[PDB]
Design a protein around this nucleic acid. Structure first.
Lengths: 141, 78, 52
RNA sequence: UAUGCCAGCUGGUGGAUUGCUCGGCUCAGGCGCUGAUGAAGGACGUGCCAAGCUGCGAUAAGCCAUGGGGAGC
RNA sequence: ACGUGGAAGUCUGUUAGAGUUGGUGUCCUACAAUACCCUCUCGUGAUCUAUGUGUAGGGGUGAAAGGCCCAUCGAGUCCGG
RNA sequence: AAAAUCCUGGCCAUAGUAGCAGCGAUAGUCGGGUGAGAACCCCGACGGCCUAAUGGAUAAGGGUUCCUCAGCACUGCUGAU
RNA sequence: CGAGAACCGACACAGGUGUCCAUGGCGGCGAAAGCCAAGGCCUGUCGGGAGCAACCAACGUUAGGGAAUUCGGCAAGUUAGUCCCGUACCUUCGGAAGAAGGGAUGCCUGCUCCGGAACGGAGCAGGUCGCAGUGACUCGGAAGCUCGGACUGUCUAGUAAC
RNA sequence: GCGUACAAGACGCGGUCGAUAGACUCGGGGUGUGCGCGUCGAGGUAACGAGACGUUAAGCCCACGAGCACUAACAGACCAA
């Protein structure tokens, strides 16, 4: 039939071949096509128009995205993967112990800590003695 | 003339046929022959209209019992 | 070995037409032949067959 | 008396048979080298439409001269 | 004690890819002159793979079974004797 | 020649029989178009299948299978516009 | 064209055949499953009919018993993800080990902690539904004695993988 | 139009002088109380909040029975001494 028309149609349409309308009941026109100009004319007289592309579901992902990624819909009995592979170490570990090191380099730099007490904290933070910077500060006193 | 009658279409869909193949095609067949041997006509176009309705969901899922409108004219049998 | 395929899959060119011998005959992994001539500048024969 | 057996008849299928011979097989007489002046050989081309073969070679199933031949090609 | 780190013919894994244990299932005038399905082994390594290239028949190639060298192998195939 | 699992061709029974189901891809249905003819050619709707592939781009290899028009004797596991 | 019809396999052959797209969404450890886009398809190309029997291929569920079956538990089933607790003999001190065994797991409301932050991770309190919360899917049954070869690896392309 | 029957075929029942099948309603059954909203709820400024109770013998569902001609058993064909 008008498979060929289908060849054009989606082309000068700019859609896929699958999504290209047909009238139907306008198979006389479209049929007698046979020219790219012809098909994009009949396009104008909407007999030739296609669409109905699918859209993302957003149903499974949405509310779930805003729940998990926040505390919820997690726990033990959801998460697969080991303890690592979600909330890794050797990552978080450089989240602190990186900031910390810094704020014992801007101190004793700043001059606030002499050089016997920046040394001490120094390798006493790169040795799990600290919690967060604030914890660090508190012990700093 | 115009009459309303309920189409019963379990007898085919889910009754037989393939659940995950047809349902939709089965439904049309059944419908085509209750409107027919009712009217006494060979067959009616019957669509589109109750064809989206018939398959307005997946092929598999089918709606049981669609009511319809009917019209026939005296000429070539409609 | 036996066609499986295990053979036939081989998609390599070989044994194309030789310049002077119409037959394809000439391999590409070889130098020239499998029909008359090349390397010998004569004609190719061989008595592996015809009695002389 | 279906299903069916045996023989024939009409028609078919098939291509035997008979007849026919543009092909073979064999013997005999004569004759007998070609090529770098490219056989030689091969490649690729070349036709209105051209795949094969043949012929040709970018002047390409051909060009010229003489002679023969003859109303067709 | 805490950190440092990440090694490995290392582990799990139908990631890709490779292999081929059992079912002695299906098939067995096949889809197939070695196939289909479930199961199963390996999966950074002596790993897997494309293309190119080398070694030729009493010769090659062989982590060796007499395995493989185009469905041909305790001596390939073709033709000749 | 009656004979050689004899050679070549033709032909009967077998049989209107087996196969055209089996595979993690079970796929169509209702209207309509064209046509001498439509279950499978095309339009729409509804229903589905494929997600490292039944999607996109390519190597080798094939070699015109590409596009158009006209067709159905051949080929297409049925039919065919 | 590049392939369940354009390649090799005598065929429109369920076989074989290299590269790049590995960053589409939810999911989750994930290039996994499952579902869905974009894109492709209804050509892994014969149909129609019978509640559609026997018999066969794949497969589901079977009370009570629980390997009595059988050469042999072959086949099928069981377990299963993640976190916490805990873990024997032996040992080349590496391992054995996920030994074993026991507990937890959903949803909702409000929060704390780590981090610059994530639509990252780890916890807390309270409320609450089901027979069942890794609710599908994905996902080990475990233990002991003996023989052999130390191990990873190789092998009869096509009945042998030891 | 259906089964007290059944692989094809066969068999049996009913066909408006009708309860044969479906729909609907009820009876009889299976699960185990629905959506929504209201109160409570460890807490949290709050946002928010697993869950509890009430509404609710709920909700959802049925291959059985009855009532009921609403729908469909129409129309009509053929064979026969």
């Amino acid at each position: 039939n008008l498979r060929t028309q289908k060849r054009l149609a989606a082309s000068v349409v700019g859609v896929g071949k699958r999504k290209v309308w047909l009238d139907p009941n306008e198979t006389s026109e479209i049929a007698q096509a046979n020219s790219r100009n012809a098909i994009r004319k009949l396009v104008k007289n909407g007999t030739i128009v296609k669409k109905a592309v699918t859209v993302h579901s957003k149903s499974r992902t949405r509310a779930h995205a805003q729940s998990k990624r926040e505390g919820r819909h997690s726990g033990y009995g959801k998460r697969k993967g080991t303890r690592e592979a979600r909330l890794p170490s050797q990552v978080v570990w450089i989240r602190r112990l990186r900031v910390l090191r810094r704020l014992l380099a801007k101190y004793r730099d700043a001059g606030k800590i002499d050089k016997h007490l920046y040394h001490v904290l120094y390798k006493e933070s790169k040795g799990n003695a600290f919690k967060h910077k604030r914890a660090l500060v508190e012990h700093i006193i | 003339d115009v009459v309303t009658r309920e189409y019963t279409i379990n007898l085919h869909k889910r009754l037989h046929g393939v659940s995950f193949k047809k349902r939709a095609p089965r439904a049309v067949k059944e419908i085509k022959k209750f409107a027919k041997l009712h009217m006494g006509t060979d067959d009616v176009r019957l669509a589109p209209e109750l064809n989206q309705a018939i398959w307005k969901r997946g092929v598999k899922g089918v709606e049981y019992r669609l009511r319809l409108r009917i019209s026939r004219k005296r000429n070539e049998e409609e | 070995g036996k066609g499986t395929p295990s053979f036939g899959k081989r998609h390599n060119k070989s044994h194309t037409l030789c310049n002077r011998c119409g037959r394809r005959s000439f391999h590409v992994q070889k130098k020239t032949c499998s029909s008359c001539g090349y390397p010998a500048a004569k004609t190719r024969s061989y008595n592996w067959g015809a009695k002389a």
